[PDB]
Amino acid sequence: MRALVTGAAGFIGSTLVDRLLADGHSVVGLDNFATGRATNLEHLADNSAHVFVEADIVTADLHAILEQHRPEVVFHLAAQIDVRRSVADPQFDAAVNVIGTVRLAEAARQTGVRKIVHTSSGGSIYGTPPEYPTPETAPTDPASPYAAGKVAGEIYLNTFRHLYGLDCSHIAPANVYGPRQDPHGEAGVVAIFAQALLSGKPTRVFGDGTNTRDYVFVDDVVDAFVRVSADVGGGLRFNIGTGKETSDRQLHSAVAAAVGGPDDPEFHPPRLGDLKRSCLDIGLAERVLGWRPQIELADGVRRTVEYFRHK
Amino acid sequence: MRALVTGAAGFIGSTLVDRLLADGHSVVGLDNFATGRATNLEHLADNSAHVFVEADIVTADLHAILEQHRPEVVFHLAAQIDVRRSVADPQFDAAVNVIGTVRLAEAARQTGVRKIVHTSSGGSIYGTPPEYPTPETAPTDPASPYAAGKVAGEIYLNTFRHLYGLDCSHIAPANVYGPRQDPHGEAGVVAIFAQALLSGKPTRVFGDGTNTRDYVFVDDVVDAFVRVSADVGGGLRFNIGTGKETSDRQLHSAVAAAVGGPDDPEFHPPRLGDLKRSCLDIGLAERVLGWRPQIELADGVRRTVEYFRHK
Ligand SMILES: NC(=O)c1ccc[n+]([C@@H]2O[C@H](COP(=O)([O-])OP(=O)(O)OC[C@H]3O[C@@H](n4cnc5c(N)ncnc54)[C@H](O)[C@@H]3O)[C@@H](O)[C@H]2O)c1
Numbered sequence A, B: 001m002r003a004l005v006t007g008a009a010g011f012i013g014s015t016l017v018d019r020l021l022a023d024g025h026s027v028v029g030l031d032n033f034a035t036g037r038a039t040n041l042e043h044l045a046d047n048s049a050h051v052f053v054e055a056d057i058v059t060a061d062l063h064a065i066l067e068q069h070r071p072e073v074v075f076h077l078a079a080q081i082d083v084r085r086s087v088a089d090p091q092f093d094a095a096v097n098v099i100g101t102v103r104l105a106e107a108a109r110q111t112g113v114r115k116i117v118h119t120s121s122g123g124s125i126y127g128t129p130p131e132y133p134t135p136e137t138a139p140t141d142p143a144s145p146y147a148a149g150k151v152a153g154e155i156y157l158n159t160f161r162h163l164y165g166l167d168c169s170h171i172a173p174a175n176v177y178g179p180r181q182d183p184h185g186e187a188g189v190v191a192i193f194a195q196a197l198l199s200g201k202p203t204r205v206f207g208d209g210t211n212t213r214d215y216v217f218v219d220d221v222v223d224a225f226v227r228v229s230a231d232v233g234g235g236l237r238f239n240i241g242t243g244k245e246t247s248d249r250q251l252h253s254a255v256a257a258a259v260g261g262p263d264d265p266e267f268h269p270p271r272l273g274d275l276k277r278s279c280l281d282i283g284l285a286e287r288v289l290g291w292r293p294q295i296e297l298a299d300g301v302r303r304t305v306e307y308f309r310h311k
């Protein structure tokens, strides 16, 4: 197939590009390097099955781009990713995550694209649901602008599906970690911890450290994207996680172990916009896509620390 | 109270301004005249309790405006209102209806505003719903970009409510009609019919004329805004309608009978994005707010025709 990946210079995006190429697809990457990194794609310089387009999804002529490249599937991973940043500038977050998605859908519906695979946020969209692990049937209740824009994006794509029959599915990951996650990013606790502990710099947890997340390895997430790209799960969201909770404090201990040395984080005040608890029910992805996560946290953390050592 | 009404130069907006003035409130009207008309407010030239601000919610410094006027309640009626226009340019519709709402909320949460009363769209947000009349508990399923943006607007305001305790309620009217509705657009069937039939100009219905809507009179809708402005229904949507379905053809007959001319509309192709049926369950507004619609269609049509006769 011809595939186009927005956010392709990023952590999950670049990993997805690699998988698609390995599966024998031709892949257009698109990114504006807001948070992405050239080194994430540098290995592809001589691969003729890959073409990279620098473009801002907010302002670029996406119609022209899609008309030129004719992707069958668009994997949409370009986004403002930081919850705290979304609180500080909700307009900017909404422009990238909502307007950007709308512009892409409008371009795609006119250029013969079969399907857009959206990236939602399984971690943030549910808020404080009565059910953990949380199924997709649980009402959304975003408590950050980031979460709100992600929901908004799903809704718009569902709208384009009704209007034009432009197919869509929403990949809703939990907390994704692994090789290529930015060590110096504002988000990405595993990368942050690995970076800090390997350089013997201070680390911190927020609140009393009891916040929980559902940590899912990047390769597992990438596999879900691939599975959902087919003519399946139309207009549906799929939670992509492990369905297991790890506290901030427990994760610190797990990274500290893999790195070796001290397990002694500082305790800082809670961050406005951050949920206290997150855990995804992944039953639908299994029943519908045949998808199951392969990597357990211990194994994944090893692989991640391994990566950060080599760099 | 100190009120601010966005979309104040518009149909519902100007009518709401009048009501708030009549109730003894001070009112700041805000509009950019995208679809609003100065003539809707000209009667206030020498009214001592209204001040007008010409501003675009997408780009103006709303922070400074709200800082100056310190409104307790913002009635948010500024929007791109045409479903077909939203299909033709979903980006523009999203910019006004989503980005504008976000900018407003972000300004409001910083300027001590107590509550934003949002205008959703009870007619469009449910798409094709499971049942008619449709209650607020029915899932949203927008099938036009306009509908999608209204849903997104609700969600963002709920988010700001979580973040900052900036209160919000969502007025979700059906199909509003009455004096001051612009007769020169493609939206606002009652006004379009009334002016055309009065002038002996051609009229049209779309498809086979069987589309139904729930026609609710502007004065009733305005009363709902007033009631919900108090500390009641935080984070909730209220359907505002009559719970009665009238077909396009039936509506044309009603307007023609009031005008007194022929009842012979042209039939034009169906409009992409337009739902076939709309009917709202108004039980929640009745219980919580004590709101009930007073004006039946026949009465409302008469009042509307008479406004256009003398204008
Ligand atoms: N990492 C997680 O835990 C996680 C889980 C759920 C959702 N997500 C979603 O996954 C996607 C990828 O995130 P990531 O973890 O790889 O982070 P990332 O920052 O590495 O990737 C995001 C990419 O989008 C690009 N981008 C941002 N704004 C853009 C714009 N206006 N135009 C073009 N490109 C733009 C960035 O430059 C970057 O390369 C995002 O949609 C994110 O919201 C991430």
Ligand SMILES: NC(=O)c1ccc[n+]([C@@H]2O[C@H](COP(=O)([O-])OP(=O)(O)OC[C@H]3O[C@@H](n4cnc5c(N)ncnc54)[C@H](O)[C@@H]3O)[C@@H](O)[C@H]2O)c1
Pocket (backbone or CB within 6 Å): B006, B007, B008, B009, B010, B011, B012, B013, B030, B031, B032, B033, B034, B035, B036, B037, B055, B056, B057, B058, B076, B077, B078, B079, B080, B081, B096, B100, B119, B120, B121, B122, B123, B172, B173, B174, B175, B176, B177, B182
């Ligand atoms: N008429 C209906 O049947 C109905 C029912 C449900 C929802 N609504 C909502 O009610 C509200 C009022 O609509 P209406 O029927 O009075 O239509 P209208 O066009 O008369 O009023 C909308 C007003 O918003 C203003 N506006 C638009 N974009 C703006 C911007 N960027 N900055 C500032 N002002 C801007 C317009 O100039 C206009 O005065 C809208 O939010 C509409 O979506 C209407």
Ligand SMILES: CC(=O)N[C@H]1[C@@H](OP(=O)(O)OP(=O)(O)OC[C@H]2O[C@@H](n3ccc(=O)[nH]c3=O)[C@H](O)[C@@H]2O)O[C@H](CO)[C@H](O)[C@@H]1O
Pocket (backbone or CB within 6 Å): A081, A082, A083, A120, A121, A122, A123, A124, A125, A173, A174, A175, A176, A186, A187, A188, A189, A190, A192, A203, A204, A205, A206, A211, A212, A213, A248, A274, A275, A277, A278
């Ligand atoms: C629950 C939730 O909304 N999850 C989403 C959110 O992740 P988060 O915003 O939760 O990601 P993050 O890596 O910033 O935080 C994860 C966890 O680690 C903790 N922490 C973080 C940094 C640090 O130095 N120390 C520390 O303890 C933090 O308190 C939290 O409980 O955004 C991601 C994109 O960026 C994804 O969309 C996730 O699905």
Ligand SMILES: CC(=O)N[C@H]1[C@@H](OP(=O)(O)OP(=O)(O)OC[C@H]2O[C@@H](n3ccc(=O)[nH]c3=O)[C@H](O)[C@@H]2O)O[C@H](CO)[C@H](O)[C@@H]1O
Pocket (backbone or CB within 6 Å): B081, B082, B083, B120, B121, B122, B123, B124, B125, B173, B174, B175, B176, B186, B187, B188, B189, B190, B192, B193, B204, B205, B206, B211, B212, B213, B248, B274, B275, B277, B278
């Ligand atoms: C069901 C629905 O989504 N309703 C919403 C939508 O109204 P609509 O988009 O339904 O409003 P409209 O006045 O454009 O059309 C109402 C009805 O009148 C018919 N018609 C219209 C014009 C004409 O010349 N002849 C004719 O027959 C049309 O086929 C439709 O069935 O948008 C409004 C804002 O603008 C509100 O948000 C409404 O809640």
